[PDB]
Subunit: 56 residues, 4 copies
């Protein structure tokens, strides 16, 4: 696992998102995915493949 719970991450490119890792998912299309709760918008969560994200 590239990231763990509570890591602060951001989207590398395109649509912006930044905040803490709050969860995990895996599908065939996205075998390593993460749920990220926005630091700016508490309670709002988006999910992204690991390649979309970087730790800060």
């Amino acid at each position: 696992a590239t990231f763990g719970m509570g890591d602060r991450v951001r989207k590398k490119s395109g649509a912006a998102w930044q905040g803490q890792i709050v969860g995990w998912y895996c599908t065939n299309l996205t075998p390593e995915g993460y749920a990220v709760e926005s630091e700016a918008h508490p309670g709002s969560v988006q999910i992204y493949p690991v390649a979309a994200l970087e730790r800060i």
Copy 2:
């Protein structure tokens, strides 16, 4: 229409979101809905029923 393009709005309660109205949708479940581009996270857009939102 309660809101128009470019209005600054926020979620009234629960998961937070704030930024500008960038679009519209309508379904039977949500006959008056809005797309809101985050002011904190440019490019990221979420969609909400009108009752969830308030103009600021």
Copy 3:
């Protein structure tokens, strides 16, 4: 506008989605975007750039 309200469309590639155009959005990152209500999952709506979608 490539599509209009009620057109039946699907995602061209990656994550699947199919149903009817129910709305529109525009941002700098996505200057021509569409809200698509799933035909399989009524009430659930996802939003996509026009290039992601094709009419069927």
Copy 4:
């Protein structure tokens, strides 16, 4: 944990969604949340609080 990986679940009410549990998230607003990959739309994943979902 109410559900486990691979359980087939659906939304109880409102916007429809159905498919398999593919992940988990937790936030203060949603201390027990699940990612559900659509069975109708492979690759598409939505996330919901546990109270929104039921196993089938």
